[PDB]
Structures are given as C-alpha cells and as structure tokens.
Design a protein around this ligand. Structure first.
Ligand code: URI
Lengths: 122, 121
C-alpha cells in the first residue's frame, strides 16, 4: 500500500517548480488525481523536498482535525493552487491554476518524521 | 551532445502513439546501431513535458545503486526494442514490443531533466 508520506509527495510535491494556465490540468492528470474522479482542490509545493520536510521541525500548530502533529512553515513557500472550474466534467477534468507564496501547514508522522497530509496554506 | 539531448534522441518518440519494423527503423535512425547493435532500448510515446515531469515524481533507487531515479505515477505508452538472436552488426535486427508501463528514468542537472532510461515496470 502507498504510504501516507509517499501519497503526500505524489499529491503535493512538485519541486521542479506553474507558469502556464494548463499547469494544473497536466499535473493533476500526471499525479493520478483524475483517474476515477476529478480531485476538486489541490495544492502543489515548489520547494525542495528537504525544505518541505523541514517544516516538521518548525511551528507546531493544531490540525484542522484536532490532532497536534501539524506544523506551519516559518517561511512562505512557492505554491500553486489547483481548483476545478465550475464547468469541469469528469473525465475531462479542468482546473484553474493560481500561483502564490504562502506558509504551508502539514501533518507530520513516521520515521523519518515527514509530511503525510496537507492541512492548509496561509 | 548534452546528456539531455542524448536522452531525447535515444528514448523520446512523441510523434508515435509502432509497426513490426518500428525498432529496425528507429534504432538505425536514432544512431543506436552506429558502433554496435545496442541490445535493448525503449522509446517513450509521451510528450517531452510529460516525460520531463517524471523527474519530480516517485523517487526510486536506480539499478546501479544511485539515488537519482524516478518512476512515473501514470503508465506511459512505450515501445521496447530488443536485438534478435540472429542479429549481426552492422545489420542490426530488433523485435518491437509495444506496452503501457510506468517508466523509471535518472535525472540530473539544472534544469533537472532525464538523462538515462533505467527501466519500465
Ligand atoms: O528497459 C530498458 C532497459 C534498458 N534500456 C537501455 O539499455 C541501457 C543499459 O541497460 C540503458 O541505459 C538504456 O539506454 C532501455 O532502453 N530500456
């Protein structure tokens, strides 16, 4: 079974760095987020894996689900928000791509202690 | 020739989505039979951007033990070319096999791009 950490990397890491309007259409397809359904909302982080994993050593904050293993990045990070358009219809999943620089909040667990869930961008 | 250009020449064929003569023609036309009959070679029938994106997908160990290999999350249309038993340089003969598989490539450089085709799974 895919680990939670591996799932986080597949769903949310794109360290190669989004300039195009079609970025989300291609990425969402390439990360298997459109196979059975259009994942409506997703965020990709364009920092190194090492910088993102380091967030697990930064600001401890509550998770939306009430657990206490969430962490906010001290710095802002280059991210892209992908949100399915109002007219998007599976299997032709269409997304709006929005670039931003925001702090991320992830849940961390395991050994190595790394992100396993994307909680929010702030 | 940069390593990235060498990877495109050796392994990219996006124009195709492959006949029984496909490998015989392609192995010759991409200079993979110039010095010797290259024994095994894979061509990928995806866009360059799609193959390049693999360098940000699933990090996996390379066959040589290096750590810079990446497996595609999605399957990709590929053709494997394998030299026949009767093939004798310089008339290199190949069996052509179409498949849809995850690919594993090694990436290097800035930009971080594919420079080696490691395997299909
Ligand atoms: O499935 C495979 C296995 C190997 N090779 C080629 O054969 C070389 C040696 O294995 C590799 O660098 C690569 O160019 C392929 O093209 N496809």
């Amino acid at each position: 079974k895919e680990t939670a950490a591996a799932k986080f990397e597949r769903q949310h890491m794109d360290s190669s760095t989004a300039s195009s309007s079609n970025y989300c259409n291609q990425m969402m397809k390439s990360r298997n987020l459109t196979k059975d359904r259009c994942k409506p909302v997703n965020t990709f982080v364009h920092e190194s894996l090492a910088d993102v994993q380091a967030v697990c050593s930064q600001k401890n904050v509550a998770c939306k689900n009430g657990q206490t293993n969430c962490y906010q990045s001290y710095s802002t990070m280059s991210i892209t928000d992908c949100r399915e358009t109002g007219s998007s219809k599976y299997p032709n999943c269409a997304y709006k791509t929005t670039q931003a620089n925001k702090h991320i909040i992830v849940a961390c667990e395991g050994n190595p202690y790394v992100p396993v869930h994307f909680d929010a961008s702030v």
